[model samples]
Target: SNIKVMCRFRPLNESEVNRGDKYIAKFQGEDTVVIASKPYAFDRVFQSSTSQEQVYNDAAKKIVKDVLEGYNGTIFAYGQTSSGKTHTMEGKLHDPEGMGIIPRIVQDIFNYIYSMDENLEFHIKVSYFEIYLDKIRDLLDVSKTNLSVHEDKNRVPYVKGATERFVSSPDEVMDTIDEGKSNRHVEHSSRSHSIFLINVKQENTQTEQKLSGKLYLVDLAASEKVSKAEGAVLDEAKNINKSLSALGNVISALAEGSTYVPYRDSKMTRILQDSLGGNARTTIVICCSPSSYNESETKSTLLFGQRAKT
Candidate 1:
């Protein structure tokens, strides 16, 4: 499958338990998850007790491996605010058991390189950026703002003036992430979508065969919280946040094999054009809170995952 939909249920926080919030989702065997007496199954089901390592193994490790094999890969997390979206993607740095998908992915890339053919020479390039309210800004170089997306001869979209770094070791990648996060907007409160991209290029010196692939690790803005202007027609409000709804529509559009997709409706979807529809091996991870306090939002996220998997 080109696109895989996965679900992760985060453990309830201490404060949530203090006020009587209880567990929600239930698992049947490996893949099926049941909530509110309805079964919604996906490619993978991560229970509350699943570790970061386990999650990386099941959800993201294959994408990293595929990128090395010259196939584009993308993994994006969708959830309500504070639903363990960021934690699952970029967890505690120093904690061995706590390191998220990002840390483990960096290490695995080098591991794969060291174990590969001797004739293969690899180059790893990195870039971090954010799309905020129709504007793209470089995270690696904060001074660069208002970047534009341009398509190549083949219609592959790329940022015109984003800072890119070529790094040798895992520390270099990790350190670069630190520098980028330092410039990430705190007040934005995830109003923007951030992407940490790694471009893998390699040449087999023996035969002079070259291949390049890009891996997009995206953390989108909170799926809820619609603008007041868009909330005019209320079916539980939210006329629809452009990116969140457009992303779902894109998935359904492709899943149904339609001709005209409004991919240009949102910057996030436009940037993810390749991954959303045809070429890349994509994974959509929906994070859910396991507390009784978040029943509706969890259901909302579940609905998106349902649409995505369809």
Candidate 2:
């Protein structure tokens, strides 16, 4: 099958009721899925930008029941830094009763497979990993330097090649997810912040052709503060921030058709260059707080996402 995609535009509560009417919402109740970055709230659901969870559930039910029968399927979340990517990816783990998109997806897939066990043999494998400081690290690995990125020759979406992994079950996926979450350095300070670029590689390996799927669910680090103030301490911070700014500049330049895109300037964009707008289904959520203080930042975030989509 060739690459297919759908786009959803979620709006905040205060925004218009027809949240995504302006955008071309081609994905349907069966072909698409959604996750929530924030906790369930009635107000937010009424808005266009926050309706992913509701719309996604509807879409997933149909997909699981129809098109994906006895085959591999994938649904992943992507968005800007701090855009609730983590919230959506692992929401159900933190709140099992309210399972997030991915976990619930696993549940749906397995339940269906078991129901059909009398006629079919099925096995599910899950793999989890993180891209940190630009290196792809396996979350399930015990050693600190446990995983590395390998190139895949057959894929699209501008990502030249993709990573390879081996996985075997849902429980294993959960265990690895918990381990990775624990080891994640969620440090908040003038010196350091934390983020993990994640992917959930799922396979139903029951078919002769080997049905396998990859969904890149990435959560990037929040833009850090780089102090330009005096002192040797502040200088280090300044350099880190400079590097991040440079990466942003490159994405902007590339999106605008600038002859030269500075992918070499920052580790974030370079590591992601392969996948930025690449073949696998892509969506970006621009997480922003509705406040005057964040007006400029939010506007820039929206614009960046818009460009990235292009």
Candidate 3:
């Protein structure tokens, strides 16, 4: 399976607009965008006015649907800070159209469950964690600050001490999500990758058969990087970029169809072993800003998505 790479350019903020900032990212029809007079293409592209439903339909609907039929699915919103990655993944949970992909995915899962055969049973569970400075911190359990990534006998990776809550309805799932949301009170949150995993298990009582599916919704840390002098400051920032840069390397390897993908280089890559170039259906949404103020980061993000097109 191939990784589906999508792009979204968010509206400029008031500050940028008031300062007469220009948009370096220019839309060229539906699938391509031009920046600095150069073109980049993606599987799909969304503009500032694109609604949540359309984005879901084009970018993630198929993967979520496949999860119920026994497939692992992963979707990520990648970008630098204030580029609207969180808005695309988490959005306004309370509003109908204002909601994001996470809540929308939860609602669709329950909808699919309710329509299944009466003789079959389904169990839904969710876990939330953030990878901070290359370490996994359980968002559902604050005390679990040093959880490690582990592999099962089958070689699938998972968090050893992460909390997984079982749920029966959409409301229950949202409550569990909200509980984790409140735990993200640290200033370092935006600098971390947050992964919310939804696990599904189903059993057919008539035939004694079972099926399992995993859906990982990831909001990667802000991907901005720069050059600064000094020993400690450089290492501290390098440490912050450890997992993110490793992820970029992994993406490049997968995009190039290379034999060796360096998943062991970072905890984030190790945990995402199955989702990259594996059996799972993976989609990466490259979130960006139209303003030239962030043109460098946006250009890198665009090229990253372009590399994943094939």
Candidate 4:
């Protein structure tokens, strides 16, 4: 498929409800959402009451098949802090009800590959990294710092010196993912931007032909603006917001069908240019909180999704 924009409303947490926060967003249907009287259309919309299975079925499961058939796929979750972006993208692997899209994807892809024809050979390589203060940090090995982003003649972006582990089972993949998560850099309850990549290469022994596909699962940093004094804190906030703003500009330019899309405005957008606007299949999950206290951020998130959809 082509680019798709999906929205999800995170259910109010216990503390949020205890503070008597009211819901300001509503899901009008399966594909439409209304926030404070403004309607936004998306490829799919999941209500606060939706389940993990339902989300995967509606937005992500099919991408596995597409990748197996030799096409790249990308799905990223973006929104304000504590809006369930992490939960939606990397849920509890052991919890059936809480399993996130990435876990399910690992399971599904491995299962499919194992079930394929006996004459076919497949290899899977996985990598994990996060962008902190505009620097790429290797999630698998924290010692590898200041990792560089490189592009081929085709302008497809990739990280140089990033660890790519080969795996034969879904459990192995899950264990590596968990290890990477533990190594991630988080400050003040906010996570750095992360990209989880799975590259699949297959060959038919009889035909001697090779096919490859890549699946990119991204978790963007929180989009909410933060106030901090002129220091490292402020610098971090500025860099985060700058990349996010660049992403917004890219989306807006693409939506307007502009001849010149500024993918190089930021490293974040540059790395994702192939997935966002070219031959790859892309999906954006706009996570949002229904709390009235966050009405402004909720509105901004909706508008971002709407612009992307356009």
Candidate 5:
């Protein structure tokens, strides 16, 4: 009863002729979108400014319309660290011409519900968290205790719930997003850059868990690359690359449908749990640049995507 749609963007110019198109969808059990690098620009803003925000809003409206009708929807950016994942997920939300997928999604979902003629009550809550250095950190939690674990290996967080405000107006929805963003912590680190992960989990009952049902996950991590050099820096890079390589190995095995999958081999994949490769409707975007120096990186990106498709 669900539809799968892919918005593929053609390569920008020469040298990209053979690159595959971008994709986004929610069908079967998948509701997440991962943005890859081959298709660099998303949401048409880089091409033209006038219609950028409107175009994103229109897409958001359509998805929300489908969701209210009983379909779960999500759009996310995923690529090597520093790929335009952050830009695509959290672009200038307040700007009419610079909004990104996540913000627009927030706006449209609430607006659609508010405009509905039927008396339908929807309780929406938002949460923000991250997995850093193989550990989960609750961005919104002041106590900052490490997340707990479930039988599925999904890490849980001891988070302080924010004051839930029931809303029936578009302005109120916008205010929620604004409030969430205000509480989010931002910092720059040379160790590994930052990415915004927006989890919008909707609840139908007061007793239901905030994380239940379909979840829209936006995963943006710093790019992964192997650079050769001398000194202590190389060791640090090697450690990070080791974990990323572990991820690569896991993807390879999954694509082959290996009887012994390695999702439990690492903390990241363990945290991803069933969502990484399971019955849930899953979509991934690999955002990478076509730079000549990045040839190897590009190959890894493409190969990963190819395996995910299988």
Candidate 6:
């Protein structure tokens, strides 16, 4: 029951609105949605009219609070190409109206820390990485490719040589994040999957009590049907699709209460094993296109959410 699944629909752009692209999905309330006469339930649903503040307050803010309470939490945004996953997770920086969830999450974390007991001291560290062609590439230091995933004695998994930076304030954290985002590899219809991690540690000066939590904000590669290509491009597409399929298998296996979870099927799933079915509190935000032209991919996205809900 650690996972909370949510849905978000991007508002149609001006040109789409002018072209009269009708929406096949509609929100029944704040938590239920109906797409093509099929109803799907979620922890919450953010419609086209929903604002960033509303999204944070409804879904992300609570998770951040739990992180401060010594609970690991993860937020994942998944969808097909051009479905607003990037805009939703990493929108225009510094613009309150357009600021995405990660920026606001950072701000909220610091705000809560300052408002807490004065005797409490906190330490925050950040790491960023991307999975390209089944290889782990450190986003903070692009020179490090083929990074290996290893777990500590406590069963906490980490990239063997990932670059992690310490930060005293939200501004410093944001600066590091902006740098990582700039270094990420991007191309049309083929985007690299990214994981942004923030590790939190706190100690009480009076009582000497200590607590820690990990926050993972993942912008998964767009999951779409890949047409047959050739050469290295084909190999990349196959690798991406294979990893996405592995994710689907892992989710289905977890939902079915199976003893065998195939987390090692792909680098992405292996990296996310601790966050998906472990003690971490997880949230999945399924992004989808409202236009009929994308009905197939949108339906697949919804189905994935449905399976993950179980």
Evaluated against the true structure, the overall lDDT of model 6 is: 0.80
Candidate 5 lDDT over 225-276, as tens digits, reads 6564765456546544555555556655655566776766655555454444
lDDT of each: 0.81, 0.41, 0.79, 0.81, 0.45, 0.80
- 2 versus 3: better TM-score goes to: 3
**Tens digit of per-residue lDDT, candidate 3, span 123-211:** 98889998766678888899989898889998878779789988888788878878877776352245567888899989999798998
Report each candidate's C-alpha RMSD, comma-separated, in the order given: 3.6, 9.7, 2.9, 2.5, 8.7, 2.5
- In terms of lDDT, the poorest run of 10 residues in model 1 is 231-240
Task: Identify the candidate with maximal TM-score.
Answer: 4
- Whose TM-score is higher: candidate 1's or candidate 6's? 6
Please provide the root mean square deviation of candidate 6 (C-alpha atoms, Å).
2.5
Report the lDDT tens digits of candidate 1 across residue range 215-241.
Answer: 988877665644554432343223235
TM-score of each: 0.88, 0.53, 0.88, 0.89, 0.56, 0.88
Q: After superposition, how far is residue 73 of candidate 3 from its true place, in Å?
A: 1.0
| Model 6 misplacement above 4 A | 29-32, 187-190, 227-231, 253-259
Give the per-residue lDDT digits (tens) of candidate 2, residues 1-310: 1122222333333442334312222222433322222221111121334443664464344434332343223332333343344445555565655455556655665565556544344454434444444444555453543343334565322222222333345565566566666655332322222222223323433453333333334454434334345644454445545654664565456445566766667544454555432322233333443333334444444443333422
What's the C-alpha lDDT at position 219 in model 6? 75
**Clash count, predicted structure 3:** 0
Runs in model 5 deviating more than 4 A are 1-76, 80-83, 152-213, 227-263, 268-271, 274-279, 290-300
- Candidate 4: misplaced stretches above 4 Å? 153-155, 187-191, 228-231, 252-259, 307-309
Model 2, which residues run further than 4 Å from truth?
A: 1-52, 58-85, 92-98, 118-120, 142-148, 151-172, 185-207, 224-279
For candidate 4, write residues 89-208 as lDDT tens digits.
777888978998988898889889878887988999998988889988899898998988898897687678999999988889988888988898761344467888898999999899
Candidate 4 residue 244 Cα shift, in angstroms, is 1.5
